[PDB]
Amino acid sequence: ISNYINTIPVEEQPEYPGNLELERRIRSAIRWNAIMTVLRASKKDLELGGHMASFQSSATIYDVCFNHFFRARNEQDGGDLVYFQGHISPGVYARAFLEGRLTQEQLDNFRQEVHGNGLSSYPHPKLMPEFWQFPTVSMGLGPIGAIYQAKFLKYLEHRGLKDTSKQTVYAFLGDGEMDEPESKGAITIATREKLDNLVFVINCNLQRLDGPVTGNGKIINELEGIFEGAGWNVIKVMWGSRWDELLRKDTSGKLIQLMNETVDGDYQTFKSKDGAYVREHFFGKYPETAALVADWTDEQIWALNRGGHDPKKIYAAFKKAQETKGKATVILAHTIKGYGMGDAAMDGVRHIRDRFNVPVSDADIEKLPYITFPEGSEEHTYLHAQRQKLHGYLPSRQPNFTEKLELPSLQDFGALLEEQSKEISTTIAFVRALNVMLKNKSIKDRLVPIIADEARTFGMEGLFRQIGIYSPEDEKGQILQEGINELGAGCSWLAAATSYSTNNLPMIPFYIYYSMFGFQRIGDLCWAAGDQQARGFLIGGTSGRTTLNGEGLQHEDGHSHIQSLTIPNCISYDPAYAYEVAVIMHDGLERMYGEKQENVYYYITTLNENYHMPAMPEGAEEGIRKGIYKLETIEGSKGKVQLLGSGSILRHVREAAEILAKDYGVGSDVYSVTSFTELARDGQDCERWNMLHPLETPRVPYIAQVMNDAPAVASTDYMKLFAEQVRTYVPADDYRVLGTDGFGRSDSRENLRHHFEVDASYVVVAALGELAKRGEIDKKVVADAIAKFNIDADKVNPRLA
Amino acid sequence: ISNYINTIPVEEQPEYPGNLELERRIRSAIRWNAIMTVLRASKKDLELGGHMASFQSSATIYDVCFNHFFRARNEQDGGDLVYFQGHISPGVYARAFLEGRLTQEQLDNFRQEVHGNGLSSYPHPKLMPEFWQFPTVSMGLGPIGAIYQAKFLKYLEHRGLKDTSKQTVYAFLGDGEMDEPESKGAITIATREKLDNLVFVINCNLQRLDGPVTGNGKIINELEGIFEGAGWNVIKVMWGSRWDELLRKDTSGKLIQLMNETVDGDYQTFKSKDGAYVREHFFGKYPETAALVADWTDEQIWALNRGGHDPKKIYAAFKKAQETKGKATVILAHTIKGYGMGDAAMDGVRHIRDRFNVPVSDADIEKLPYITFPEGSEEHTYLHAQRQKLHGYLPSRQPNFTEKLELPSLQDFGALLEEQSKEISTTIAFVRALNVMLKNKSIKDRLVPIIADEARTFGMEGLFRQIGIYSPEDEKGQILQEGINELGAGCSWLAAATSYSTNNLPMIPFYIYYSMFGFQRIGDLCWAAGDQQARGFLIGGTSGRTTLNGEGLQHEDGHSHIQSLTIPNCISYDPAYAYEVAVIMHDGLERMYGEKQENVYYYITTLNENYHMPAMPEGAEEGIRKGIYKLETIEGSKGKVQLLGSGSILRHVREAAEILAKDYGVGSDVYSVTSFTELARDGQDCERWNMLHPLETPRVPYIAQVMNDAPAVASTDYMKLFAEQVRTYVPADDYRVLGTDGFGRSDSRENLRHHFEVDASYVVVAALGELAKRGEIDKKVVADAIAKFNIDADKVNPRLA
Ligand SMILES: COP(=O)(O)[C@](C)(O)c1sc(CCOP(=O)(O)OP(=O)(O)O)c(C)[n+]1Cc1cnc(C)nc1N
Ligand SMILES: COP(=O)(O)[C@](C)(O)c1sc(CCOP(=O)(O)OP(=O)(O)O)c(C)[n+]1Cc1cnc(C)nc1N
Ligand SMILES: [Mg+2]
Numbered sequence A, B: 001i002s003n004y005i006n007t008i009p010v011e012e013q014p015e016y017p018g019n020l021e022l023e024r025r026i027r028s029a030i031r032w033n034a035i036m037t038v039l040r041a042s043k044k045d046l047e048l049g050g051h052m053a054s055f056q057s058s059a060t061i062y063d064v065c066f067n068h069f070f071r072a073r074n075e076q077d078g079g080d081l082v083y084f085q086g087h088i089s090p091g092v093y094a095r096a097f098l099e100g101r102l103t104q105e106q107l108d109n110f111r112q113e114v115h116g117n118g119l120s121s122y123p124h125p126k127l128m129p130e131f132w133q134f135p136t137v138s139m140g141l142g143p144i145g146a147i148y149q150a151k152f153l154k155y156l157e158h159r160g161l162k163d164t165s166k167q168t169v170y171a172f173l174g175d176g177e178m179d180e181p182e183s184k185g186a187i188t189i190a191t192r193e194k195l196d197n198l199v200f201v202i203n204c205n206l207q208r209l210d211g212p213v214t215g216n217g218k219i220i221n222e223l224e225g226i227f228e229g230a231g232w233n234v235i236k237v238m239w240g241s242r243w244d245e246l247l248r249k250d251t252s253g254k255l256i257q258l259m260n261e262t263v264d265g266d267y268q269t270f271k272s273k274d275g276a277y278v279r280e281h282f283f284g285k286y287p288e289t290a291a292l293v294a295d296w297t298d299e300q301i302w303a304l305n306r307g308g309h310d311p312k313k314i315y316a317a318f319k320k321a322q323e324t325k326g327k328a329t330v331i332l333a334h335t336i337k338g339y340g341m342g343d344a345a346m347d348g349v350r351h352i353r354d355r356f357n358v359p360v361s362d363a364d365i366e367k368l369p370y371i372t373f374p375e376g377s378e379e380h381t382y383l384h385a386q387r388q389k390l391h392g393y394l395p396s397r398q399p400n401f402t403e404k405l406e407l408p409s410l411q412d413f414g415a416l417l418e419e420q421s422k423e424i425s426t427t428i429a430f431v432r433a434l435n436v437m438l439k440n441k442s443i444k445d446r447l448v449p450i451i452a453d454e455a456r457t458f459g460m461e462g463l464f465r466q467i468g469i470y471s472p473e474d475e476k477g478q479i480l481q482e483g484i485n486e487l488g489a490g491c492s493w494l495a496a497a498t499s500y501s502t503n504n505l506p507m508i509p510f511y512i513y514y515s516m517f518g519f520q521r522i523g524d525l526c527w528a529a530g531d532q533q534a535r536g537f538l539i540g541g542t543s544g545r546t547t548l549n550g551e552g553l554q555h556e557d558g559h560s561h562i563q564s565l566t567i568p569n570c571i572s573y574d575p576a577y578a579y580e581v582a583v584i585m586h587d588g589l590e591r592m593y594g595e596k597q598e599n600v601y602y603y604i605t606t607l608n609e610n611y612h613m614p615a616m617p618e619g620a621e622e623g624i625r626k627g628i629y630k631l632e633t634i635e636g637s638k639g640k641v642q643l644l645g646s647g648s649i650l651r652h653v654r655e656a657a658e659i660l661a662k663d664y665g666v667g668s669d670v671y672s673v674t675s676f677t678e679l680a681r682d683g684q685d686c687e688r689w690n691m692l693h694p695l696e697t698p699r700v701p702y703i704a705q706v707m708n709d710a711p712a713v714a715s716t717d718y719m720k721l722f723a724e725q726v727r728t729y730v731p732a733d734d735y736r737v738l739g740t741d742g743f744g745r746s747d748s749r750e751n752l753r754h755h756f757e758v759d760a761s762y763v764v765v766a767a768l769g770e771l772a773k774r775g776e777i778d779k780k781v782v783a784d785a786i787a788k789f790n791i792d793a794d795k796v797n798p799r800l801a
């Protein structure tokens, strides 16, 4: 930690390049319009909400950036990638309005978007696809997302894919936000990868929502301490220009001592008081500090401001960051939350227009009028002129990429569509599919395989020697090894999955990891990715409750599909066979990066269990995409049932089919369900449409176009809800579901599938029971089956075990 | 960052108090048994798994702790709280076997737990309730969990609840694991809270799973830098005793330089070569370092060891840690992964037998025998003697607390059971229920309210005046304010929710936060909390997609209930009324902390919207707990339907009930569903039982007991699946579900409820549609209603909007 003063002394401060007086005029107009936007919204009494105090504290920081640093998207690259602090959006909207990018009607529709001419509360690309770029309001995601975005830009340059050297990634963070583990938890990576294209700007107003971040301490010193120890360049912007002569003439060193020892709580106490109070409780602490202001009026003492409010100090910081290489820079900007709002922290708006010399008539204040600058005026010309020198306006977003990719056809995956002679797994199939893609001239180098330490577990060692590991193992390596860091790997995946938009450079990431540590562990990031319109593949390996058999309770995933189905634009599949993996990957590729450019991302669970992989049934492709298709029907004269399975359990459902036919003369229709979730969504969509068009021909759910009315049984390696979700749409009166509800445990696959009541034996007993209720077979046949299969009808429900 | 040598120079290293040679003999037996356990499992060829290399690198570190530091649970306190690294469990079992706490057959059932006499792969309290205590195999959860556990212990002492001062919290971490954002993301908290009762022990073997943590850098220096910067006491245990005369004899300083400059990757390379290579490639870098080992044999060179393998060095670190006050300590122990396993990490078994002088003859080696120490033997006496001086054995766990609490009766919540004068919300009801509890003498001081910088939004400032904020606002304060840190708050809640076991002191935490940032953001901790048998309340405030109307995409929660239902022992409710919240909190209090001592935790979503709160109907208590009860029956002679609602949307389904009756003569049965999930679980249990008892009379799901066969419509503020999950159990032919699928956005509650198609007009249209489909009414009247209600039948499905 260093003294509690500016890192950059006046002698090293560069001359400010802009017109300070003009800038303030424009800035006061942006401040005013931001407050008018939120106040007008409140007057509606619709509980819309909105913030003002935060932007008031950081307005000048953003202003210096818009006038002198921020590069907009241009012909060469995506420009500077700015992660705006989420709740200061009114200020962003106010500047956009001033630049003529938004209308007054839009501002009057702040937080009222349903009808189409409004503005979102926060940065949400999904809601305003041509404006916002990075979703940051869920605190903590912005910092880590920015770290991996900066690292990805360097990756694109090192790989010879795009010269991103002129782009800088700015992450505007709150100080309270720095307590989120995700906020400082990965800062060490910025130093390992020398991210000198990354700048963290922390708004240190010393406050969060309920109170001071650390009243009894000094948050700025805490931040400096850990960032410095993590190897970052730290620049503190503590005090305004009025303090220079004071610090300059104090030869005793007491003013610094005093600044150092005063804690955050007392500093916040001063800003609530007045000049006389500061003379007494701060400077009055020591004779030498009291002597520095003896000649000052209380009004002059009260004028002393924090550094983050002085354009000259701010500029110095951003310019120095720009020059700093070999590591990332964090700017700790000292500010006042609620700055210039005074009291308010209908005549208090009067106070604001007085404080910022806002050009609003006093008999007009009542109408809460927006201020604009006419074309031809000093302000309008200056506003636009600075932006043009910086390539235009931001934030802005391009919804689609421009180039045309020559994607592999399904036949290019032809090997995976045939019967495999050796027993392999769906993960092995996934890797083989990747290799096919790695042979396509159009996308081979746009692929971005990502792993979190674990590569040997998924047998990815082969691609290693083939395409290498990224290590600026050299800077041309293609695979991103993020170590034991699922969140970091997910942010790398997100940066890659949205490159088509931010850089107009489509990249196709495949992040493979232990499924349990997917949505369950990084779900907030997965929701954010949906908002950011990510297009890529998330591969949940070692999936299924009973399949990763020895690992137990914290590894056995029997519910990730329940978590993924909550994300509207995530398309989830649980394939049992290699040919299904091939058809699903090809389709996703085509939907996301083909001419359609669909804004969806994929989640495919894969397995670590080897078994026989049959050839793809002729004509089964569309059924695989849609979610279900019939494998075969087995004959039998004593009854008929429908058996559905997915993932690793399908082969056991087929085994049940052979038993039912040969031991009981019960025939059946056997279906491979590649996506219960897509089938459920389709069914929900059909019934919604039907409800809304009562006079028209009812739409039939896709699952009902494949299944018939015979009693059905479904079994999967996930909790019952995964298959039970399509109940409404199944055209049979009987639909029994087996699943892996309950905490996992260590044992052999055979023992877990029996414990979780999902194996062939339970499918047979479940099927026989449906026939027995129909009076087709004797109930004792079901009872004798339970006995012969060694089923404990009275053991505790696995969910409670 | 300091030089690459031990922090504690030999001149300051205390005398080691144990018998090194006897300890080595015991440790050798433990290493062998750990290895035999895993190899024996391996021979089964059931893909059971298990690790050996990691424990081999850390065994001595744990050995010194078991012999000289680890306090076991005792009469005064719960002993030291040890977060054992998950995958070194085989060594913990090996030792427990040796202390005679586990049997040979149990070791033979390593990773086979279904039949009841086996051992879990990793620390899982749920699976071994009397043995393991803290779930650590999900990397990164252990370190942050340990930080807040240490903090909770200080809270208990300060509140005057228990003298926990002799307890130390040890977190055994891997160096690869430190990359998880959760691993270092909260370390500044240990400094702010002066947690001198916390010790982080990082095993720096420089390797993770697929390679070195950072081969081109120095992970130990990286960790020292950030931890020192965060304010911790850092102790590096780098080199063994054989290096001392050497560092002393060098006066050029060339060794220290050489040690500082060599990078992780090369050190790993030396541990593969041999004395010859190291003397030329390490000492052979400068003539002065070569000179120091000039008179050494290559074999003497090869015997140089890393500090984490030397008991004398390990002891000094732990002793220094134990004495330190004012801050937490982190011990960076330098070790060799796969230590002594040569060949890999009967020829291999022969080698480790020889390497560690294991008392196993050549004749017995192929039997892969377990070693034991007979009573009376030197080894048996010392193993037990050291543990007795340290109060017993660990790990061990007490599943239930001993004291009897005198819980408040439902009658004590009587005010909340009556109709309310003022319009209030379920969140206000929750706060009042807490106030009832705060009056109960038996539990008032055991309550632990937890907030994450959102107290103001939840209107909890009334509680502050009452019980205060813990800030050691004084260290007697009862409320834990964790700031903007959901993971941290969740970890505090976990420590408190598990105090009943750990400290035999029941504490009842209530963590309230924005529901969106619950399971979605800290889901992995929530699953681990289930493993740890947490008993507490998670309150998801500002919940429902349409109810937190102005916040938008990343705040509007229409799916946390879909995430929470994946946890077997989490009981979730979405109440509409103040009386339902009181009945629910009373039942949860009683189930978890009453005589039953049920191992479950509660999740209740509450609202920020005020509306009329009526009186609880006479006798509805049991239905409220079960998940559903009939609120009212409205007459109508043109038709009859059943309407179900929960949360904030129930109010709306009741308005639709009124409209249907007044405008269409359609009668209805209206039900409040306080828990679709408990109803779904009950339906599944009934169906599972029915399947398993074919000869018995079928059991009826509770929801089917409550409902009838009249066409049904359900609407909630959550995605459709939340209500669809009970389809199988609803005894009516038609069951239409309305829900908030899709991404949230900003607008008025009215506009959002129309957009998500869950408001009264949609419930009415859904209901008329079922009647028309049956013939009760004309299809033209459903068409006229769609128009009358200004419903756009062709707007995009909200899921896609
Ligand atoms: C709904 O509006 P809100 O509560 O005002 C809002 C915008 O949602 C915020 S703002 C906020 C405080 C931010 O304090 P900081 O010091 O970081 O920022 P600032 O002082 O305002 O510059 C918190 C905790 N949350 C809540 C919050 C909590 N946790 C997460 C993960 N994200 C949040 N965003
Ligand atoms: C199936 O067994 P496994 O993969 O060997 C296991 C035990 O599951 C482990 S162990 C492991 C490597 C840990 O390396 P460390 O350096 O931290 O520890 P060590 O070197 O072994 O002393 C990882 C990444 N994971 C996987 C892992 C990944 N991500 C999370 C969050 N938790 C994990 N536990
Ligand atoms: Mg702040």
Ligand SMILES: [Mg+2]
Pocket (backbone or CB within 6 Å): B174, B175, B176, B203, B204, B205, B206, B207, B208
């Ligand atoms: Mg390691």
